[PDB]
Structure formats: structure tokens, C-alpha cells
Amino acid sequence: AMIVKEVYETAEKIKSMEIRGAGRIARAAAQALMIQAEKSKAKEPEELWNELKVASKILYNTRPTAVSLPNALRYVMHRVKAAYLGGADLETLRFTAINSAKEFIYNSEKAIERIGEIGAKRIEDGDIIMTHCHSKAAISVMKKAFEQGKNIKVIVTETRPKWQGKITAKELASYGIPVIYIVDSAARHYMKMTDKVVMGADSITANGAVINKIGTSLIALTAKEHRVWVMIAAETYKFHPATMLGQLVEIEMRDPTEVIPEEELRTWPKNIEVWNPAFDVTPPEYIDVIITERGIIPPYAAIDILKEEFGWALKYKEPWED
Amino acid sequence: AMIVKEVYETAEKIKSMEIRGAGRIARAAAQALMIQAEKSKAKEPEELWNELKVASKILYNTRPTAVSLPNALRYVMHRVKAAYLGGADLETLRFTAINSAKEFIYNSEKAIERIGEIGAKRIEDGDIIMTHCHSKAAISVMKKAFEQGKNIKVIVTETRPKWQGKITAKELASYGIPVIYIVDSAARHYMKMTDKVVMGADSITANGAVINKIGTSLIALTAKEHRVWVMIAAETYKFHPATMLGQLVEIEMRDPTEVIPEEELRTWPKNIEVWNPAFDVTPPEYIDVIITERGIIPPYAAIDILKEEFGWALKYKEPWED
Amino acid sequence: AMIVKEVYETAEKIKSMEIRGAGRIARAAAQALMIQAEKSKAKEPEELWNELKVASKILYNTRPTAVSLPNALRYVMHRVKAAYLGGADLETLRFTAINSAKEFIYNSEKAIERIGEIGAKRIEDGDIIMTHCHSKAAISVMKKAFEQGKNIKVIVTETRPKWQGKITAKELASYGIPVIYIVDSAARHYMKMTDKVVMGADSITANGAVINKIGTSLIALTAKEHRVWVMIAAETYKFHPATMLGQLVEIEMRDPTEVIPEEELRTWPKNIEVWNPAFDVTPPEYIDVIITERGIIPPYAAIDILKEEFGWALKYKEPWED
Amino acid sequence: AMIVKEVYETAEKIKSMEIRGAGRIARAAAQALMIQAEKSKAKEPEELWNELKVASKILYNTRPTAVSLPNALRYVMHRVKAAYLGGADLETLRFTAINSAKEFIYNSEKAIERIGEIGAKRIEDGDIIMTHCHSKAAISVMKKAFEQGKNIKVIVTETRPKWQGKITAKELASYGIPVIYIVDSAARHYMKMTDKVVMGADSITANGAVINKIGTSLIALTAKEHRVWVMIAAETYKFHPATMLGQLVEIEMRDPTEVIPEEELRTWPKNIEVWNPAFDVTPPEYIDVIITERGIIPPYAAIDILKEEFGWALKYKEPWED
Amino acid sequence: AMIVKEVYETAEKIKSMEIRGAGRIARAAAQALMIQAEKSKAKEPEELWNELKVASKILYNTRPTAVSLPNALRYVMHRVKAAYLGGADLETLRFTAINSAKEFIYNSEKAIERIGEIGAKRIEDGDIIMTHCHSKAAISVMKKAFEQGKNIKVIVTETRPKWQGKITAKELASYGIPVIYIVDSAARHYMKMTDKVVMGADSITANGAVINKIGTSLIALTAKEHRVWVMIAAETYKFHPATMLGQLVEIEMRDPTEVIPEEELRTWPKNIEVWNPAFDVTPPEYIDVIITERGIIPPYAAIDILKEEFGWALKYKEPWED
Amino acid sequence: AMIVKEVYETAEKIKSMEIRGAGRIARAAAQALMIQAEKSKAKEPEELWNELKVASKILYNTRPTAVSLPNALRYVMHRVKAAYLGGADLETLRFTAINSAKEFIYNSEKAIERIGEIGAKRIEDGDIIMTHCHSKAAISVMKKAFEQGKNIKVIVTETRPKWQGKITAKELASYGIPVIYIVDSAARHYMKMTDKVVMGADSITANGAVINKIGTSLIALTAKEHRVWVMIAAETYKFHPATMLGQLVEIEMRDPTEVIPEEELRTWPKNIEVWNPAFDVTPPEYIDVIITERGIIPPYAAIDILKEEFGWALKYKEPWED
Ligand SMILES: Nc1nc2c(ncn2[C@@H]2O[C@H](COP(=O)(O)O)[C@@H](O)[C@H]2O)c(=O)[nH]1
């Protein structure tokens, strides 16, 4: 297969986390398939289909946990598969894929702004919000609240090991929003002063559980303990189809050296293992609302979102398989 | 007025956390009073007494939260003040000061051994133990349980911002004990495989609360959620006598640059505030046992420890006070 | 501009709580639109439409918290607006307004009967039921359970400040049902002898929360503690559609003189503030079932009620809006 | 009036629990409806209709608590009744009853196979599983998982009074799955070593509560306490449609001799009452998932299963009534 | 017996609650026995003893629940009994009683000021405190905090039926302390803004339970739910000796007309009973600290207070019996 | 070396549980020490000392879990060992052992009588009481309460595997107390109608945990869940002194044939392991009180009982060791 540079470059950048955040990963994946179809020198449809199947496989095999990624590929390639199988000629297939990926990207961009507007109504003037990691959906909520003239202050948790909290702090401060930066360990200590917790999602399961950045389940746990609302800002493509039929979401273990740098870890005794899980599972009981682009829901209504938007595709194989 | 150099160095080193851990700080402070008395050039008792007061003050204004520090200074200075006021000559005062310091130091070492022997009975073959920070008292228990031939494995949290987890990890590894090293945020994610939690204490209050390294409360919180025993390994001089008459324990706010290094932090805008609490408060409902040198107690019997050993002193002003 | 006297009187009476209870306020507002249309002197549809908008506005700016009120106005005005914009003549508009009002009123009466029949199946012979405020929906259930020959007894909380408990007590007594009347503070003390709790609702939100008379949350809280079922008797028009897109429900702050009478309160110093919230929010974890006219649901299925019946309308501005 | 003896044999064997488990009972009731129709000597259609109505009532008044039974009779008699009322001649009616019976029986076998496949995905290699009673749907999950190569052990609670746990223990051992057999009272003691709990269901209600073998709720309670997942394996015909309209599920009280044998019980004093409830009610807060043949749901979504599958039938009388 | 006016007048004023609050009731009881001994025209000691025995019986038989009352009588009359039984002459007995009662009154007055000083250290600048009823011990804490220059605001609950909250509000406002007055039902609604809860006690039991004004257990319940500290300001004479050997504290039921005035209750149907319990029982788990004149304790240390101060007297009959 | 057969008969009958219940076992072990001393044919004091040391070891290695047994042997052998080491001649030693045995046995009977009297005060007229196993101290409470004229019923759980519940059921019926007999699994189902729970104890630990019959912790858990008081009737010799120095209590694992009889179990596959734990561990958060013969304590005060009664003995070896 004639796979372009940008398919490979994108895949490496998802793996190394130079491209990160479940939304962005999903847009970038779709963007890459768009560039494949723009640049394909293929002659036959069968030839282009094969390229897109394989480019998709490459992109799916990057990072497992955020279902946003395979939902983006599925979006582009359910359509490309339907086109091809009703013998669409070449340019019809090339446009199906290009236009499909443009829809997904537009809809991601729109969904996020919309989550901002909905979630900001749940924020009150004077609120101290605590967040975790760097979530574009959460930030959209917080930023929108601030543009509505509510005087807010955000507590950013640094978010080890990769320090996503630095990104969140600088970003929010740059829209004018006062930020309080603390270590992940201080979450409970400062939960007393916190009015609302607003965080993102990578996968959301049928029974209402939220897989998000390591440490999320802790922040939610103590938030529930103090009766602070836990609001998870999440696009409907964050919801995980295979969990309808009993799939456990894989938890990404990343390299030990994200925790202890190589120069130091090589000096450490052999009887120490560094474990670096990238995500944990917050059960639904610690979640008050999931804010989607289609509105506020309780977390136990995640199965409704998946039935009405993804149910149909689970008797079908994956649209890049054969 | 005529204070030796070892007092000043010791205080500089407690401030800087070159010397750290509650127990060690207490011993280092006794030592410093010891050396002041050993090397004094005083001629009258009143002169030595005056040096030992001032040196006491300097040592106390180093770090507020670990009560071990002022409890050590009191063990020396209660005895030194009663001698001075009983008319003791120069050399009798000098020796009360030196010999009191030596007793505290000897009792601190024996107590930690004994805590180890007692706590280790609560560890069972195969156990997986989560800990936090670096606590000599906690390590005593794990070390002794391994020497007894129990195959334990210790989950060690890195303990940001100052990374005491690293100290714990290398230490435990050095005794042959296998370690699983994780970031603080992962503590709930791994609580499901943990059998015991074993941490230390800086201050323990009348009502049973444990003030220990920032994050301790979170670990205890999710331990409870999971029905994992939380054991606090702690010497009687970790108990806080001022709290029987309602004193709140000061939580030390340490420098922002421990969290975000100087180079970086100077690049950040005014409207980010870095907050660095070094301790939090874990409520007694989340603690199962405190393991002291005089045995196992439930946290609520903190008051009995305080009454039977420290109550007597609360009608008096402070031993180093004029 | 040309608003009848019955509209103005009805709004005065909703404000003053001469007419009160969510369900009754909704019916009273439909009625008032009915009478405005019956008695209008308009010649063109545009003139009647203009009266029905203004009368709607006046009725809506009476009391914020019970969503039954604006849901009643919408049931009339959605239908009136679609007729006007479909070119309806004067008399066709007049009749859409009158007949819509009549349908709402008829459905409000049938729904409360049906809630009664459904909820009464969950009451068992010998039961002791705590209630709160005066709710027609709750009373429907108790009344019907007694008529079925079940020997029930109802603990009635006085419901300060406005004393709706008294209304409930006299009513239940009048049907032959024995009552135990207690102050609000005694609710936990008597929860141990209570078998069921049965209250009403003013608004029910997307995520399952019940906004009902001040104190309801406390009663539900200790009911849970005690494992006593909390049943909310509530019509579909108690559900709040604005909350699916993240609106917070306004909690009505009523006059201080309801708490402390005018004579007394004028004798009190400036630095006492009397605060009179008329409602609180009970979270869904403390509610076991909502009993609607279409059946039993768990509180989390509030969103399904809102979606299938009210979602359609949230792309449009308000039916009475210009 | 002319009822074949197979109907009576079945009904007897359901009362005495020679035929047991909610699925098997249901299949056995349809099988008897099937045989009644095959072997009927009725010469008019009205006469067969009367034999089936009657057979249905004989079968329904055996064991009240498992809704599987009346849902089976419903499946057949809704269709037999629609045929009959549309003029169907004799042999059309007979076939409708036989083929409806056959449909339900094939569907039951297929549903359980599919629950096994959905549920096994939630069992991970290593897992220890506690179960209760003998449930064909719980066993499907445990069997498929072992067939998939996962090394599991199963804690089989003995399930007094009727010792269902022995059936489960021998069965699982027979597939090569190691069993740990314990008394019901040991559930909490061993819940620390348990990773998943998997049990059946006799009825599931509109608000998500699960009715299953006496003891199930105790196991789900201490499982929640310890954060072990509680998974209910339940065919959709275990869901109870009368509960949408507020019905309480009857709790069968079986013979005292099941607890204490006849020989011994007759010697006991009159003032010892032996109470044998055969089922209890587990609230939905202690259930993490229900695994049906159409996928995983949170317990709150039972109402969705009921709305879509059974809600149509509630405004009509029962299918076997005059 | 020659009983004085003031013994009778005091007893009526305790019953009618013109004299109220457990501390004050106890002082007034002791004051009354003081006035008996001042004015007794008795000639013999046996004659005076008999007067004091009977005057005590009168005073004990006023209100049952606040153990402060019998502890005050016991204080005076353990001593008077010991004096008399070592044949103290008349004036020796008269002084024993007068002086004993002066000690109790001085010690009550001192203990309260002291509880103020201890408890105020647990109050932080900016705190919103919620209280209940009118407690001199609680007010001492709050007032002292305010005199220390901490800027506080107190939420006073009105405290039905008898409105003790009016007393609390006016009193606190008169020391300059901003007060927020609300109904007992609003406690949970406003618990989010509350930093500390400070309340009194009437009886405290061996196992740590606090009997205080009806509604106390509710406020503590929701305070625990939100992690607001519950601090009970209580003198050591609030602790209940007989609970060491298994006594249940009697809960005072007061007259129905405290709830519904006579003029209205006489018009109400016969099938309504008004129940007016004056106190409820807050379990120890909802209490953080009990502040006594001897310091902060956890509530589980109430048995220590009773052992060291009251244990001795429980093999003896009551010191006014014969 | 010369051991009387009564010692061996006793030890056999303790292993086989012909002698059972923690109190009775203890009395029976002292009785055997007593008979050994009475019937000894030793002519030197050293020779009797050796027979008692040995008798003690034979008795201690019967059943590990109930500390009552070694605390009984301790009571005798501390005193026999103090006599022996103070030069005591033969007949002085013999008497010391007989009279110590006799003291412990009289004390046990008196302790249990007094627990009945303290504990009955906590039972109120009407009460329904759930219990577990057969406990002589729990039965004392229930009996005294009935003797006092209170109309109670008792829910007697059958207590598998050894059916202790039948002993309890017949015994209580024999005093005229109505019994409800249920299987262990029915505990939660019937906890709603239960007002008090009253059970025994085999050991009680330094931190307040109670070791009692397998199932006790499940009953205490659902009792807490429902806010039913859990009361433990326990003589002070049930408190476990090794636990002050960190010891874990051994959980006796008895024969699998107690669960499944020999005849049946031999037919079962090899891959079914039958596990028979005879005790479990109830944490102190689920126990409201321990009733001892010296009064009511919260479970946290067990450490106070231990400090004052047994702490002296811990720095010495066991009384029967060389
Ligand atoms: N914050 C704080 N709490 C303390 C201190 N001493 C004792 N405590 C007690 O520790 C507990 C902490 O509860 P939290 O607010 O963490 O839920 C409270 O019961 C509080 O009364 C102290 O110095 N600071």
C-alpha cells in the first residue's frame, strides 16, 4: 500500500504524545486519513480502499485507551466502506473520505464550543473550580464561564507524570482566569475550598464509568466525600461502543521513564518496578453530570447515548477489517 | 547570646530539609542543645540557661508542623529548667542538658525499633503494602516484617513535590524488599491490590487526627473505601500536647519553587499562584491503628497517650520561655 | 396591552401563596389564559396573540421555582403560537387557547389520580409514612392506599415557615387517616418508626434531582441513612426542560416576615439577617422512585421523561416571547 | 376443563422445586403449554383457547416470585389470544401455541449463551468469583470465561435452606473449574480475596432492584463495601413489567420443613416460629451491571428494557383471563 | 418538712422553662438548695437533712433529660450526706450544703468561660458557624472567637417549637456578631457555606452519644455528609453516670400546645396526635470533638470522663434517698 | 508427666466442641487445672508445678481463637507461678491452683449475671432482637430483659455449619421468650423489623474489633446499614492481651465434614475445596457498645480494659513455660 508521510508522522506524534488530548488525537487521526485521500496516487477504488484500510490500522495501533480515536476512524470509514461497496468510482470514494473527515473535524470543533455553553450555566459567579490534566472540553466550560463575567478561580492539578497541568495553567491564565497550581496530592486538602470539579474524559462506558487521566478517580472520590459536584465535559464520540457488549477498556501503561528519567532509573536497583498507568476508572457514583454537546445527562444515561448513536454498528466488523 | 555554630547549622539544615523526617528532626534538635551545652564557655548557670533558651528558640522557629521537634526541645528543657531553678551549679546544668538530650535520642532509636517489632506482627506473608513519603517508623515495620521471612512487596508513592518516595524506594530495595513505584495519582487505581497501608506521622492530635505528608489523607480515604487497613507507625513524641486545649496545628506552606523550579516559574504570569502545603490532616475515621512504642491503639486513644505523658506541662509556659 | 382582571388577580394570588402547590399553580395559570381568551375584546388575531403573550409574561413572573407554572403556559402557548403563525382567524385562535388550557387542566387532574393509583401499590398494610409540605400528588397516594383498606398512619412535618403541614394534617385527618404531627427538626428522631417517605416536587432536573419545599433534602438524607424508601409523587409537568441544556433552577427567596412577623422583626438589630429559601435540592442518590402518571422510574430516568416529551422545544425561544 | 396430565405434572414439579431456577421454570411452563396444545382433543377453536387459559392459570399459581414464569406464559398467550380473536380456526390456534412455546424456548437457550459471551469479557485471567444459589445464567458467564483459557476459581456459597450451592459446585467442577465451597455466613470473610461477584435474578424491577435467592442482598452489600463488582446475569424475561405501574414483587414463603426437617420440628415448642423466605431484594446501588442477552446495562436502565419490551401489554388484562 | 418558697418557685420555673438551658437549670437547682439551708428554721441536723432530701426530690422531679440537674444535686448532697453521717452538728451541715452549692455554681461559671477559650482556638478567622438552640457553652465559644478579632458570622437555627433560636440570635447580635437566622429545615441547604458547627449538650452518654435539643441529630448528620466539623461544647457535669451501667436517657415529651397553640389545637380532629419530643440523640460518629472545661476530647472518650469523675458513686444509692 | 485423665477428657471435648462457647470453655479449662491439682500424686512442689505447666499446654493447644481459654489458664498459672517462685511448699501450691480455679469460675458466673443486668436496661418493651450463634452472655441480656416484663421476640439465626442457633432457639423458648428462627442468609431481609442486635464474642482486640462466630460481621454490617444498634455481650476475659503488642488473632479452620458430611464429601471431586472458617472479624465501626461486667463501653475503649487488667503480664513470658 502507498501510505503517505503524514499518516506515519501523525501516528508517531500520537504515540509520543506530541499530539494529545482525546479530542485532538481524534481530529488528527481523521485529518491524516483526509491527507491520505487527497494525495493518494491510486488508480482503482479497490486500491484506495486498501490504502485507507491500512492507514487506519496504523492510526488505531497508536494509543488504546481514548475511544475518541477509533470513533473518528469509524466515522470516516463506515461511510467510505458504504460508498466503495455500492461501487463508487474513484473520485466518489476520494470525496466520501475527505468530506467525511471534514464533518468529524467540524463536529468535534462545534461539539466542544457547545459543551462550553451548556456547562457554563452550571458554573456560578465566585466559584472555585478544580480540574485535572488538560481537557479541551473542560477548559471550554471554564473559559465560557469566565467570558460570561462570572468571577472564577481554577485550581489546576499538575498531573503527573507528564505535567499536563502546566498546559492547563498557562492556557487558562492567558484568558485572564486566576489559577491556583498544586500537586495532585493536595486535592483533598483543597477540596473544602472547591465549589465544582470539572474534568474531561477519554472513554465513557455503558454502565456510566469515566476513564480519564490517572488521578481522576481520586479527585472524584474526595469530591463526593465533600459534596462538591463532579462534572465531566465529554463529546458523544468519547463514549465507548464495545462496552455495550462487555468490553473492558484497556488501560495504557506508558514507559517507566516518564516517571523516573532514564539517567536516574538506570542507576536504580533491579528489584524496583516503575508502573505508569496513564488513566484510571472513576465509577459513576462519583459523577454528578456528564455534559455532552447534546446536553446534561446523569452518568447512568451513557447507555442511552451509545444505543441511539452506536448500537447499529456492533453486529458489523470494524470498517477497516477484511 | 553566645550560640555555637552547630545550632545555627542544624536550624539551616532543618529549614532546607537537608535533615528531614519528623523523628530525625527531633533527634537533631536534642543533639544541637547537647553540643551547645558541651561547648559552652558560660561561667554562671544563668548564662548557660540563657544560651539553652535562645538555642531552643532558634531550633523551634525552623519548621512548625512536626511536633516531634518542640517535644524534643521540651524533654531537654523541662529537665534543664527544673535543675536551674533548683539552684544547680554550672556543671550540673551542663550535664542535665547533655544527659537529657542523650536520653531522648536513645529513646527515639529504641522506640522506632519497638514500633517495628510491634507493627510487623500485623504484616502477613504475601502482603502488599502501600506507603507514602519516607517515614523511618513505617520502614521499621516493613523491614522487620521482611527479616521475619514474610514475602512482602511495597507500593511506594513518589511523594511530590520533594520526591521522598525515591528515598523510600532505594532504601526498601537495599534491604531486599521488592518495590512497585507509582505517582501519587495512581494510589486509588492500585488500592485494589494493596493489603495494608503503612504511613508515618508528624503530629497526632487529641481527637485522633494524623497530620502527615501532603497526600496522606487521600491515600487513607481510598484505603477506607477499599477496606484496606491504614496503620500509622508513630512514636509517642509525635503526639501534640497543645491540641488537648484546642490548638490547631499549623500546616507548613513551603516554597513554590519546590513545585515549579526557579527558571520556569519566573516565566509564568502573575495570575498563576503556586501553593505548596507540605502536610494534610487525615481524620481518625480513616485510621485503623496507630502503632506506638507502647503498643497498638485506635486513633481515638490519642488522648490517653497525651494525658498520661504530656498533660502535666500545659499549666506551665514553654520550658525555653522567659 | 388589554389584560383582564382575572389574570392580574391570579398572579397576585400566586405571589401571595393564596394559590399554592406546584400542580395547582400550573392549573391556575392555564385557567387565567383561558379566561383572558374567553373574555377578550380583540378583533384581529395579532391583538389576541399580543394579549396572550403579555398575560403569559405576567403569570410567569410570579414564582420561579415550580416549573409546572411555565410548563402549563407552554402547553397553552406552543399551541396558540402554532395556530397564529398558521394564519388562524380570531375565533380559531380564541378556541385553541381555551381548549389547550382545558386539556392541561384535565390532564393535571387525571395525572394526579393516576399517580395516586400507581404509588398506592407501593404502600402496604400497617405502613407509617412520613411526608413534608402539602403536596396533592403525595396525598393522592396516601388517600388511595387508605381507600384500598390499608391501615396507614402518616407522620406530618409542620413545614415552617408557612406551615403547610397543618393543611396536610387536616386533610389526611378528614379522610379518616390518622396523623402524627411533629416539628421539622424531629424528622430523624422519628425516621426509625417510619416505613416510607412520600413527598412531592416542584421541579425535577435532567440528572434526577428533586427541587421541593425547604427541608425535603434533610428528610431524604436521613431516610437514606435509615434505608427508608423515598418516593417522590410527581407529574411529568414537574420536569424541568431548561436543565437538559444546563440551566440551574432558581431557588425562591421569600420574605423574612414569613419567618419572623413584621411587629417583632422591626425590633431586631440591623446585624441579624433573616434568610427564607422556600426550596432545596435533594440529590438523586437519596431518591428511590419518582412516581409519575406514566409509571414508576428511578430518578436518573428523569432525562428520558424530558427527552421524549420536552426536548423538541429547546431549539425555539419561549412561546410567549416576541 | 380438559387438561393434559403433563400440565399437572409440571405444576407439581414446580411447587416441589424438582424444576427450579427462573429460566428453567419458564421453559418448563411453555413446554407444558406446548404439550397441552399438541395433545388436546378439542374440536372447536374456543375449546382449545379454554384449555390454554386454564393451563396458564394452573401454571401461574405455582411459584409467585420469578416473573420469568408469567412472562413465558405471556409470550405464548398474547399470541394465542391475538390469533383466536382474529378468527383463527382450530389448527391455526394449536400451531400458534406450539410455535410460540418453541420460540420462547429457543430464545431462552440463545439468550443464556449470549449472556455467557458478554459476561465472560468482564472476567479477567486470575479472577476469583463469588456466586450464590445455582444460576444457569451466572454459570454461563463463568463457563465461557474458563473456556476462553482464563484461570479463575469460584467461591460457591452453599445457599441454605435448599442447598443450591451443591448443584453449582458439582456443575462447575464438572467443567474443570476449581471451586471453593463455603457457608453463606462466610461471604464477608472471603470477600477480600474475591475480585468479581456474579449472580442470577428471579425478577428485576422498574427502578433497578434485583430479586434473587435469599442472601443475595447480603452478598451484594459486603461486595459494595469492599468495592468488588456485582454483576447480575439476567435474561430480559426476568424483568418484571407489573412493577412499572407500582407493583410490589411477592416474596415466596416456603415450607418451614425445608429449614428444620419434619422429624425434628415437631418436637420443637410452639413458641418458635420458623420463617423461610426464599428470596430477598437487592437495591440497585449495590449492583454495578446487569448482563442481558442484548448487552450490559447499569441497574437503572431496567426501566428502558421494560418500556421497550413489555410496556405495550400493561393497558390490557392478562392473556389468560375472561 | 419545712420547704421554702424558692425551692417550689425554682421547680415550677424549670418545668415551665422560664429557667432553661442545662447549665442554668443546674445552677438554679443548686441555688435553691443553698436558699433552703440559709432559711431553714430547723433545730436538729436530722431535721435539716430531711428538708434537703425532700427539696432535692422536688427539684429532680422537674425535667428529666438534662443530667446537669441531678449532677448538681448530687454535688451538693454527696457532701451533705457525708457531713451528716459523721455526726456534723447543725451549723456544720448548713455550711456543707451552702458552701457545696457555691462551689458547683462557681465551677459551672468557670467551666463555661474555659470551654470558651479552648473552643475558640478551633475557630478560624472568616468562619461561618452554624448553631442550634441556645447553649451558653456554645455561645461562650463563639463570643470568645469574636473577641479574639476573628471575623465570624453565625447561622442561628430558630429551633422549634420553643424558638430558643430567637434568644441565640439577639444575644450574639448584641455582642456585635453578625447573625444569619433561618428555619431548622434550611440546615442542609446552608451546610455548604458553613465551616463549623458548634452546639451544646444536655446529656452525654458512656458510648459517646449527645442528647441535645430536637433537631441536633439532623444538623450533625448533614454536617458529617459535608465534612463540616461538629463541635459539642459541654461541661463535665453534662456527662451521664447511669449510662455507664446501661441506662437509656429518658427523652422529654413536652405538651402538644408548644407546637400547635391551645386555641387552634382544640379545633383539630381527634385522629391527629401532636408529638413534641424536646431532645434527640446524636450518635458519636457525627461528632468530631467534645470541648470540656478539661479540654478537647473525641466523643468516644466520654467513658474516660465518667470513670475518672463519677464511677465511684454508682454502687451507692442516690444521696437524697433512704 | 503425670497428667490426670480429666485434663485429657476436657481437651478432647473442647476439640470436638462437646464443650463450646468462649465462657464455658474457659471455665472448663480451669476446672481441669483444679482437678489435676486435687488428684495429683506429686510429693515435691516442683513436681506439681510440672504437671500444671503441662496440663496448661495440653489445654491451650485445643482451640486457638477464643482468648477466654488462655486468659483462664493465665488467671490460675500467674498465681500458681508466683506461689511456686516464693518458696511455697506442696500443699500451698495445690491450694493456690484450686482456689485460683475456683475464683475464676465464680467470677465468670457473676460476670455473666451482671452483663445480663446491664444489657437488659438497653432492651426496651416491644423490641425485636436478632442474635447469632449461641452466646451465654447474649442470652443473659435477653433473659433478664424478659424477666423484667418486657415483651420481646428474638430472631435466632441458625448459625451454620454446626447449628448453634438451634441451641439458642430451644433455650430462649424454654424461658418463655418467643423465637423467630431463620437461616443466616435471611439476616438483611429481616433487619428492617429488628430493633437491636445482641451477640457474644470470642476475642476482642486492642483496637476494638470483635472476633465471634462466622457470620457475625455480616450481621453487624447490615445492622449498621439499617441503623440498628449492635451490642456485644462480653466478659472482660474475652479481651485479647497479645493484640496490644500487635498480634493477629488466629481464625480456627475446622473440619470440612462439619460443612458437608463424610459420606457425601468423599463422592465430590478433588477440585472442590471446602473451607470452614469458624470465626470472622467485625470492625469496631459496626459495634455500638460492648457490655462487660464493669459496664458499657464504646468499642474503642477495649484498649482501656486491656491496659488496666492485662498489660502488666506482657513483658513476662507465658505462665506455663520453661
Ligand atoms: N484542620 C485541622 N483539623 C484538626 C486539627 N486537630 C484536630 N483536627 C480534627 O481533624 C479532623 C479533620 O477533619 P476534616 O476536616 O479533614 O474532615 C476534624 O475532626 C478536626 O476537628 C488541626 O490542627 N487542624
Ligand SMILES: Nc1nc2c(ncn2[C@@H]2O[C@H](COP(=O)(O)O)[C@@H](O)[C@H]2O)c(=O)[nH]1
Ligand atoms: N443546586 C442545584 N443543583 C442542581 C440543579 N439541577 C441539578 N442539580 C444537581 O443536583 C445535585 C445536588 O447535589 P448537592 O450539591 O445537593 O449535593 C448535583 O448533582 C447537581 O449537579 C439546580 O438547579 N441547582
Ligand SMILES: Nc1nc2c(ncn2[C@@H]2O[C@H](COP(=O)(O)O)[C@@H](O)[C@H]2O)c(=O)[nH]1
Ligand atoms: N422490597 C421491595 N423493594 C422494591 C420492590 N420493587 C422495587 N423496590 C425498590 O427497591 C429498593 C429496596 O431497597 P431496600 O429497602 O432493600 O434498601 C427501593 O428503592 C424500593 O423502592 C419490591 O417488590 N420490594
Ligand SMILES: Nc1nc2c(ncn2[C@@H]2O[C@H](COP(=O)(O)O)[C@@H](O)[C@H]2O)c(=O)[nH]1
Ligand atoms: N482481620 C483482623 N483484623 C484485626 C485483628 N486485630 C485487629 N484487627 C483490626 O480490625 C479491623 C478489621 O476490619 P476489616 O478488615 O474487617 O474491615 C482493622 O482495623 C484491623 O486493623 C485480627 O486479628 N484480624
Ligand SMILES: O=C(COP(=O)(O)O)[C@H](O)[C@H](O)COP(=O)(O)O
Ligand atoms: O438543648 C438545650 C436546651 O434545652 P431547653 O432549652 O429545653 O432547656 C441546650 O443545647 C443545652 O441544654 C445546652 O445548653 P447550655 O450549654 O446553655 O447548658
Ligand SMILES: [K+]
Ligand atoms: K476484593
Ligand SMILES: [K+]
Ligand atoms: K430496623
